[PDB]
Design a protein around this ligand. Structure first.
Ligand SMILES: N[C@@H](Cc1c[nH]c2ccccc12)C(=O)O
Length: 295
């Protein structure tokens, strides 16, 4: 009765907006819509100062639980409260983010949905689609715990497949353009993990790379659709619906400490056909046939 939730979205990028749409759809499917739920929505605009101030407000405002969309938002909320339920919406590495003890028994007030990056499949796609690529530049933020883990895992798989990965971390969106310029003289392809900083500034990557014409393998449909070549990605709307359903489970009494994390890990490829063709890339018949989405 009297359901009230607070939602902190870390920043505006299209993937997070679609996750939030999914949250609303999942709530509505369970009857939590219109007069049956009050949602207090806030967006920290990628600003850690806003994360702190907004988290403090959301956990002290009579909400039954709070929801953090993306790792920095969930971390802000989990720091601000140890007793109010905190639901993760698409946190790539909950253990490495210090949000849960393990996936089975989170052990505190935090549970939710995790989008694991399919690094092995991305490496396989790079090898199949651009067999001339030898060195990959990993562009990501040093501010994001999610990306630290993904870069480690990707590098391990890439090395096994005979590729080299050089890292180009940025502390913020401000350093993207200049970093792209530097890295594109050093690497054959740009890879971007599930990274909120780069996702929020992705058109800057595309515009900065117009002169270099290196393929970009960025870990979101929303990035591939505005100039990336291809990736292997998890369905964002599915992440949001699953988060909505876990919010309802917790409203109905589930204890976060004993509620397993819902991990998505396999995804499907997404291929930007015109970007490939413009780069003079052949899309192998099998690659095109197995594609989850063709743009
Ligand atoms: N999983 C990311 C958030 C996220 C979800 N979908 C994305 C797409 C692009 C970049 C980031 C994201 C995190 O842990 O914070």
């Amino acid at each position: 009765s009297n359901a009230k939730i607070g939602v902190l979205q870390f920043v505006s990028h299209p993937s997070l907006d679609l996750i939030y749409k999914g949250i609303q759809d999942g709530l509505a499917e369970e009857g939590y819509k219109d007069d049956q739920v009050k949602i207090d929505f806030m967006n920290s605009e990628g600003d850690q100062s806003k994360v702190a101030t907004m988290s403090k407000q959301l956990v002290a405002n009579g909400n039954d639980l709070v929801v953090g969309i993306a790792t920095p938002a969930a971390q802000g909320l989990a720091s601000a409260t140890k007793d109010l339920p905190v639901i993760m919406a698409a946190i790539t590495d909950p253990i490495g983010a210090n949000l849960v003890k393990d996936l089975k028994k989170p052990g505190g007030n935090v549970t939710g949905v995790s989008d694991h990056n399919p690094a092995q499949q991305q490496v396989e796609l790079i090898k199949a689609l651009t067999p001339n690529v030898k060195t990959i530049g990993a562009l990501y933020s040093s501010s994001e715990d999610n990306s630290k883990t993904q870069v480690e895992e990707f590098k391990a798989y890439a090395e096994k497949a005979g590729l080299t990965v050089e890292t180009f971390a940025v502390p913020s969106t401000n350093e993207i353009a200049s970093t792209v310029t530097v890295m594109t003289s050093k690497v054959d392809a740009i890879w971007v993990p599930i990274d909120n900083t780069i996702a929020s500034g992705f058109p800057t990557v595309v515009s900065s790379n117009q002169s270099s014409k290196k393929p970009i393998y960025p870990s979101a449909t929303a990035m591939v659709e505005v100039g990336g070549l291809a990736s292997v990605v998890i369905d964002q709307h599915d992440l949001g619906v699953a988060t909505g359903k876990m919010i309802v489970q917790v409203l109905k009494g589930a204890k976060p400490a004993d509620t397993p994390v819902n991990v998505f890990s396999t995804g499907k490829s997404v291929i930007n056909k015109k970007i490939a063709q413009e780069l003079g890339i052949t899309i192998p018949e099998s690659v095109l046939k197995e594609a989850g989405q063709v743009i």
